[PDB]
């Protein structure tokens, strides 16, 4: 149950962290988002879990 | 016209955009949307252009 705005932020940061190469700026930014509100962190965690499950099904 | 999206890609792009418009989205739904975007360059591109035009349209309402 992630609110839509949190979800799009969650998606944008997850996708950035999937690039082959990530900048320190982007990391710093991702972490700041995660740390800014517990729902950010929760959204991040759950999205990690299902992304992993999804890959295991391809 | 100005480069269109193949029909099946657009159909998927509309589906994923509308899912993300819901007041609440599941993590499963995010993971699926991301996987689609990542599966082919056309998907990601369609997603981005669709965000752009949806925003423009909203500014016209």
């Amino acid at each position: 149950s992630i609110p839509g705005e949190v979800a799009e932020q969650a998606m944008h940061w997850h996708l950035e962290l999937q690039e082959p190469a990530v900048s320190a700026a982007t990391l710093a930014a991702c972490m700041s988002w995660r740390q800014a509100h517990p729902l950010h962190e929760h959204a991040w965690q759950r999205t990690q879990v299902f992304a992993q499950r999804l890959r295991e099904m391809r």
Side-chain angles (χ1 to χ4, degrees), chain A:
Chain A
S1 60
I2 312 168
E5 292 181 354
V6 175
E8 37 223 16
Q9 295 167 357
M11 172 164 56
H12 165 86
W13 288 118
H14 178 93
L15 291 173
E16 291 300 302
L17 263 281
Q18 287 293 305
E19 299 267 22
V22 174
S23 75
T26 296
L27 282 185
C30 180
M31 290 189 305
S32 174
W33 177 81
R34 289 175 58 177
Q35 289 184 288
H37 190 291
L39 174 46
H40 294 177
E41 180 63 19
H42 180 71
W44 172 268
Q45 289 293 325
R46 296 317 287 157
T47 298
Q48 290 328 103
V49 169
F50 286 84
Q52 172 185 2
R53 291 183 187 170
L54 200 158
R55 285 197 300 269
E56 294 185 31
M57 303 169 76
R58 296 273 202 186

